[PDB]
Design a protein around this ligand. Structure first.
Ligand SMILES: Nc1nc2c(ncn2[C@@H]2O[C@H](COP(=O)(O)OP(=O)(O)O)[C@@H](O)[C@H]2O)c(=O)[nH]1
Ligand SMILES: [Mg+2]
Length: 199
């Protein structure tokens, strides 16, 4: 079965673009009009069987402050997103994490810095520290290129199932890349996180 996943972060960070990479989850999405949400059934296939993350994507109301309690309620996991080309989105991560945990106190949470395909990166590995204090997991991602798409969900699945050896045995069908994520740049970004991490 299944887990409610809430996807939060400033307007314009690429939450909608992200959740939409998973093609069947977009085709089978369900409206929850009473809370201004579209729930996308993101199925992933593990060595322990199938897991379904029901990802709750807003209809843009985060542009105007915290979300309603009904949005967060009964969430079993979360992704907090920021835009690595917009420093204020990173600065707002504490506010999202507070908005989130007030309603969902013991859930696994991953932090994702999106748009790493844009050449002029502002929030670099050296400054990404918020996950460390809260012992949350961080990934760089690029929704438009599918780069690291599966990472946040694999880390959440390991935490929810309590199996640090879980693996995905097949990739979901994803929208074809709309930008190129340069493999050398990606490698260097992962390296920089590793090097920031040993500090
Ligand atoms: N370059 C780049 N642009 C992105 C990416 N994800 C989203 N965008 C752009 O960011 C803008 C806001 O994306 P949206 O998904 O609507 O963000 P939301 O408001 O957080 O749901 C749109 O112009 C997107 O096309 C990405 O990975 N790379
Ligand atoms: Mg959106």
């Amino acid at each position: 079965v299944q887990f409610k996943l809430v996807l939060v972060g400033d307007g314009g960070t690429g939450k909608t673009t992200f959740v939409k990479r998973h093609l069947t989850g977009e085709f089978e999405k369900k409206a929850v009009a009473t809370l201004g949400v579209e729930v996308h059934p993101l199925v992933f296939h593990t060595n322990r069987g199938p897991i379904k993350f029901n990802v709750w994507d807003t209809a843009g109301q985060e542009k105007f402050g915290g979300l309603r309690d009904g949005y967060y309620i009964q969430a079993q996991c979360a992704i907090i997103m920021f835009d690595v080309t917009s420093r204020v989105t990173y600065k707002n991560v504490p506010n999202w994490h507070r908005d989130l945990v007030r309603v969902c106190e013991n859930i696994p949470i991953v932090l994702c810095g999106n748009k790493v395909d844009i050449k002029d990166r502002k929030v670099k590995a050296k400054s990404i520290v918020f996950h460390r204090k809260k012992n949350l997991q961080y990934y760089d991602i690029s929704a438009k290129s599918n780069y690291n798409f599966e990472k946040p969900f694999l880390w959440l699945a390991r935490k929810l199932i309590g199996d640090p050896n879980l693996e995905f045995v097949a990739m979901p069908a994803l929208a074809p890349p709309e930008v190129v994520m340069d493999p050398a740049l990606a490698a260097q970004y992962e390296h920089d996180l590793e090097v920031a991490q040993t500090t």
